[PDB]
A paper describes a structure:
The Coronavirus Immunotherapeutic Consortium (CoVIC) conducted side-by-side comparisons of over 400 anti-SARS-CoV-2 spike therapeutic antibody candidates contributed by large and small companies as well as academic groups on multiple continents. High-throughput, high-resolution binning of CoVIC antibodies defines a broad and predictive landscape of antibody epitopes on the SARS-CoV-2 spike protein and identifies features associated with durable potency against multiple SARS-CoV-2 variants of concern and high in vivo efficacy. The S2 domain is conserved among human coronaviruses (63%–98% sequence similarity). Antibodies targeting the S2 domain appear to target three main epitopes: (1) residues ∼1,140–1,160 within the connector domain (CD) proximal to the virus membrane, (2) the flexible hinge (aa ∼980–1,006) that transitions from a bent hairpin to an extended α helix when the spike protein springs from a pre- to a post-fusion conformation, and (3) the fusion peptide (∼aa 815–835) near the border between the S1 and the S2 domains.
CoVIC-154, derived from Wuhan spike immunization of human B cell immune-repertoire Kymice, is predicted to bind the S2 domain and has several interesting biochemical features. Here, we describe a 2.7 Å cryoelectron microscopy (cryo-EM) structure of the full-length spike ectodomain in complex with the CoVIC-154 Fab fragment. Interestingly, the CoVIC-154 Fab bridges two adjacent monomers in the spike S2, with the Fab heavy chain contacting one monomer and the light chain contacting a second monomer. The CoVIC-154 Fab heavy chain also contacts the glycan linked at N801. The CoVIC-154 heavy and light chains both form hydrogen bonds to spike: from the heavy chain, residues Asp30 and Asp31 to spike residue Lys795, Ser57 to spike residue Asp808, Ile58 to spike residue Ser810, and Gly105 to spike residue Pro807. From the light chain, residue Arg30 bonds to spike Ser813 and Glu868; residues Asp32, His91, and Tyr92 to spike Lys814; residue Asp50 to spike Lys790; and Tyr94 to spike Pro809. The CoVIC-154 Fab epitope overlaps the TMPRSS2 cleavage site (residues 809–821), suggesting that antibody binding may block spike processing and hamper transition to the post-fusion conformation, as suggested by the involvement of residues (e.g., Asp808 and Lys814) at the fusion loop N terminus. CoVIC-154 was the only S2 antibody that had measurable neutralization.
Author numbering:
A (entry chain C): 46 to 66, 83 to 93
B (entry chain F): 725 to 827, 855 to 1063
C (entry chain C): 919 to 1145
D (entry chain C): 641 to 675, 690 to 724
E (entry chain D): 1 to 123
F (entry chain C): 288 to 336
G (entry chain E): 2 to 107
């Protein structure tokens, strides 16, 4: 029940990510 | 009567002042981070009040009034208070006189919300409303009344029968005109006439100079130039020197901010008094002994002055 | 006009409730006070998590790791910073408190002048001519309901300073001389109630020469018809 | 929607010729309101009401209104 | 029946000085500000100078400042413009006008216009 | 969550530490112009110490 | 204070509403006038202040606007109405006339 501000999160909001049906690993990667 | 109403709005960027675009200094300043925010917030509050002060004194009636294009209202000249095209901002003769007499890092000055022209227009409206409608425009619908007859009402308030005015109308008009004529001379001759307003200007400037000067103090460090320390000592050692400067510069801001808060409070008190006089002295006839000049009060006229108001 | 006045008063009171409810910012002034205090207190609490240059912001940790000689140095940094944080807080409260005190004194004055009497100050107790005020308690403050009389429905008439009858100037003891069309009357200034000019309501000041604007008319005499 | 003001450059607001009562103060006599896009306009001091002034004319109120204020 | 009559417009060599007189009739001369306006043949109307009822407030166009003097005689009902250091650009049709206001206060505008006089500056 | 750098409105929320923002004008940032390049001017000295 | 008047020229048929816009460099409050100039005729004061018509001026002419932007509107064009129009600010000396707009039949 608190709002905390931190710099840990690394995913930019509303960013178009590459779509695939070797990819460089740059400062972490989000996989879905 | 001369009353200070507002002070210059100043905003200081704490980070830029303490650290000159130096990332190293900024990281050190992250410690005790709240301090920076508290300072900016405080100064912001001061700035907002200045606008509030001005509105309370001038923006009371929201209707514009114009006097008819006639030379004398029952022999009362009124020319000096009325607006003049020759004057720089379409201001009155007296107001023009008043404005002549008064004279980097992260520091910045924020423009006042109400421009001088707007304030000038407000004063004229108040003045016009009083000359044509007496004290009725501040209490509801403004109703016209011959100026000569209005003065008769004023005499009854002080306790003199109206016949006295009608039988000495000419004499009273001349006396009034003569007094107005002296006003211009008085302000010009007496250099210290607007000292009250001038003091406000000097104090603010003085304070700001001191703040700027403080940036050249070592506070115990090898140097007062941040870039030098950064350009000579290595990171571990530099930290120590930078901390000294940060501590000193930080203290300098707090002192400055504190003084402005106390000083601002004084101005606010003055503004409230000015607001009261505008309502009681200008928009009505006061019975208080010396609230509106010495003697038995009849009427008052408002004239804009830099960072303040002048009441006749 | 008792009935009319009563209805008007009742109607105005009815609107008060609606006004406060509709306007969310109606009690902003009182709300501001609450927020400022809370804001200040949050900041003070937050400051306890600042290192101020020490290895850590948790006192127990320093005590649980470094030895006494070294710990002193670290603790001093924290003490200095925390001490400064309090002074800043205290100073702000002093200045802020002064502002509230000024406000309280004004509130006290209004209670005595507006509520316990009828004030003649122009806008000390509401806009218009003040009649009476009622005090209502509000959290950390007071709300004053000001009842005022506002003139309305104005009409324009010709006016004269004095009336010349038999070479004698007549000045109205109370009111002003008004003329609709060709008839001259004397009326109270605030409200229009025309009455025939008579010796009773006017006084004689002199001849008819000095006054400028005097108009000729007849001043009725009450005694003459009986005689 | 790039406009130049004494306060500074203003973006995302559309200049409006009409003057309205101030809603959000931008400084230097400029105020911004949300009317739907944000609009920037010069504030208006007030409406113009002038009594006809004559040397023998007076206006007497014929009615009254009782008002309660908070 | 307010009539304003202009006189004194004539050919003048460049650098010479000329005087314009406007005669006022049919109204109270000392109760209104007076103005001078010139119509250039190839250009739109240009305001030249204005004077108040008592001569307290006087204004001049930037181009004519320092070379033109406006004076009025209330007793004679006459408006005078004195022109010095005349130049080719000055040639125009000059009109004496009557301001609705007194040059002070809240009411302004050029209510009445005279027929006008022609001034030509040439070598 | 709120991404402070996404847009000005988002940034305002971070500064006010509240998701809801009331009507008003809020100062949430400072603006600087970055240096285009670094220029070094030294004396022209050939002699070696 | 420069006054800019747009459009420089327009052509309209009889019975057509006409709008002329005058702009000011700095705020002039309500001090402005609209003047009608006809060939061989002295200029005439149509509107003074912002919207106050002079006595003897047909109702078709109307005045609008405040501060920087000002507008003059003729509800229906007439043969008599075809003349150049000028806007003069009265705010402060020196008073400045606008370039002027010429109205002519199509
Ligand atoms: C008011 O009444 C007086 C007296 O009846 C008028 O005085 C007369 O004024 C005329 C004009 O000047 C003279 O010829 C008479 O001789 C005056 N009579 C007396 C007895 O003095 C006065 O003029 C009237 N006022 C008005 C405005 O009609
Ligand atoms: C004074 O104003 C009141 C209203 O404030 C007038 O009362 C109204 O009269 C009209 C008829 O003329 C009724 O339809 C309304 O219902 C009345 N209102 C109330 C609240 O009673 C009153 O007539 C006015 N007095 C005069 C002399 O004009
Ligand atoms: C109102 O007062 C002004 C002065 O403030 C009078 O105008 C001056 O009159 C003198 C001569 O008496 C001139 O020399 C000045 O040039 C005038 N103007 C100024 C600004 O001083 C004016 O006469 C008075 N009004 C009346 C009706 O007497
Ligand atoms: C009221 O003013 C009007 C002009 O607006 C005038 O015609 C009328 O005669 C005036 N009323 C009286 C009683 O004089
Ligand atoms: C003026 O008002 C009174 C009021 O009773 C009336 O008797 C008189 O006839 C009126 N005169 C007019 C309307 O000319
Ligand atoms: C009132 O002014 C008029 C001019 O409009 C004048 O004729 C009349 O004499 C004046 N009245 C007084 C009492 O001065």
């Amino acid at each position: 029940s608190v709002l905390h501000s931190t710099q840990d999160l690394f995913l930019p909001f509303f960013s178009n990510v590459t779509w695939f049906h070797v990819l460089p690993f740059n400062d972490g990667v989000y996989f879905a | 009567e001369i009353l200070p109403v507002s002070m210059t709005k100043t905003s200081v960027d704490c980070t830029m002042y303490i650290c000159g675009d130096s990332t190293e200094c900024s990281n050190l300043l992250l410690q005790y981070g709240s301090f920076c925010t508290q300072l900016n917030r405080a100064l912001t509050g001061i700035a907002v009040e200045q606008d509030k002060n001005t509105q309370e004194v001038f923006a009371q009636v929201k209707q514009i009034y114009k006097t008819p294009p006639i030379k004398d209202f029952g022999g009362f000249n009124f020319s000096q208070i009325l607006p003049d095209p020759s004057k720089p901002s379409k201001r009155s003769f007296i107001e023009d006189l008043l404005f002549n007499k008064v004279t980097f890092n992260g520091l910045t000055v924020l423009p006042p919300l109400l421009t001088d022209e707007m304030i000038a227009q407000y004063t004229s409206a108040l003045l016009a409303g009083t000359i044509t409608s007496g004290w009725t425009f501040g209490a509801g619908p403004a109703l016209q009344i011959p100026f000569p007859m209005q003065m008769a009402y004023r005499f009854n308030g002080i306790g003199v029968t109206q016949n006295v005015l009608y039988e000495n109308q000419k004499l009273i008009a001349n006396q009034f005109n003569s007094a107005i004529g002296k006003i211009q001379d008085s302000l010009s001759s007496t250099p210290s006439a607007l000292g009250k307003l001038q003091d406000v200007v000097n104090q603010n400037a003085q304070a700001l100079n001191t703040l700027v000067k403080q940036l050249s103090s070592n506070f115990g460090a090898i140097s007062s130039v941040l870039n030098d320390i950064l350009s000579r000592l290595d990171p571990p050692e530099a930290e120590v020197q930078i901390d000294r400067l940060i501590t000193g510069r930080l203290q300098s801001l707090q002192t400055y901010v504190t003084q402005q808060l106390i000083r601002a409070a004084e101005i606010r008190a003055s503004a409230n008094l000015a607001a009261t006089k505008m309502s009681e002295c200008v928009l009505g006839q006061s019975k208080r002994v010396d609230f509106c000049g010495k003697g038995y009060h009849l009427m008052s006229f408002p004239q804009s002055a830099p960072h303040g108001v002048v009441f006749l | 006009n008792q009935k009319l006045i009563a209805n008007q008063f009742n109607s105005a009171i009815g609107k008060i409730q609606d006004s406060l409810s509709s306007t969310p910012s109606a009690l902003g002034k009182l709300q501001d006070v609450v927020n400022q205090n809370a804001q200040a207190l949050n900041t003070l609490v937050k400051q306890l998590s600042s290192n101020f240059g020490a290895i850590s912001s948790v006192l127990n940790d320093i005590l649980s790791r470094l030895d006494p000689p070294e710990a002193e140095v670290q603790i001093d940094r924290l003490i200095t910073g925390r001490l400064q944080s309090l002074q800043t807080y205290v100073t702000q409260q002093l200045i802020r408190a002064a502002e509230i005190r000024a406000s309280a004194n004004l509130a006290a004055t209004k209670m005595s002048e507006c509520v316990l009497g009828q004030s003649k100050r122009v806008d000390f107790c509401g806009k218009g001519y003040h009649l009476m005020s009622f005090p209502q308690s509000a959290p950390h403050g007071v709300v004053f309901l000001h009842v005022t009389y506002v003139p309305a429905q104005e009409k324009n008439f010709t006016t004269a300073p004095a009336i010349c009858h038999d070479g004698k100037a007549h000045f109205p003891r109370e009111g002003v001389f008004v003329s609709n069309g060709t008839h001259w009357f004397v009326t109270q200034r605030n409200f229009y109630e025309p009455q025939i000019i008579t010796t009773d309501n006017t006084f004689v000041s002199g001849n008819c020469d000095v006054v400028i604007g005097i108009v000729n008319n007849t001043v009725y005499d009450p005694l003459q018809p009986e005689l | 929607n790039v406009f130049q003001t004494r306060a500074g450059c203003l973006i995302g607001a559309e200049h409006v010729n009409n003057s309205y009562e101030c809603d959000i103060p931008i400084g230097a006599g400029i105020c911004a309101s949300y009317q739907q896009s944000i609009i920037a306009y010069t504030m208006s001091l007030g409406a113009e009401n002038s009594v006809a002034y004559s040397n023998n004319s007076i206006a007497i109120p014929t009615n009254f209104t009782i008002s309660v204020t908070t | 029946e307010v009539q304003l009559v202009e006189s004194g417009g004539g050919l003048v060599q460049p650098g010479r000085s000329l005087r314009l007189s406007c005669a006022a009739s049919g109204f109270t001369f000392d109760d209104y500000a007076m103005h001078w306006v010139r119509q250039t043949p190839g250009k739109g109307l240009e305001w030249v100078s204005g004077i108040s009822w008592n001569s307290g407030s006087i204004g001049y166009a930037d181009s004519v400042k320092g070379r033109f003097t406006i004076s009025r005689d209330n007793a004679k009902n006459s408006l005078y413009l004195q022109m010095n250091s005349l130049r080719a650009e000055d040639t125009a049709l000059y009109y004496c006008t009557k301001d609705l206001g007194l040059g002070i206060g809240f009411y302004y505008g050029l209510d009445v216009w005279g027929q006008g006089t022609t001034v030509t500056v040439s070598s | 969550a709120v991404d402070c750098a996404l847009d000005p409105l988002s940034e305002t929320k971070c500064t006010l530490k509240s998701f809801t923002v009331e009507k008003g004008i809020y100062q949430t940032s400072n603006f600087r112009v970055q240096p285009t390049e670094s220029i070094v001017r030294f004396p022209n000295i050939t002699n070696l110490c | 204070i420069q006054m800019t008047q747009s459009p420089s020229s327009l052509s309209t048929s009889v019975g057509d509403r006409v709008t002329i816009t005058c702009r000011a460099s700095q705020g002039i409050r309500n001090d402005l006038g609209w003047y009608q100039l006809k060939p061989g005729k002295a200029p005439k004061l149509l509107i003074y202040d912002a919207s106050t018509l002079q006595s003897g001026v047909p109702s078709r002419f109307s005045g609008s606007g405040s501060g920087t932007d000002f507008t003059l509107t003729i509800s229906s064009l007439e043969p008599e109405d075809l003349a150049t129009y000028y806007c003069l600010h009265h705010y402060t000396y020196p008073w400045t006339f606008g370039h002027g707009t010429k109205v002519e039949l199509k």
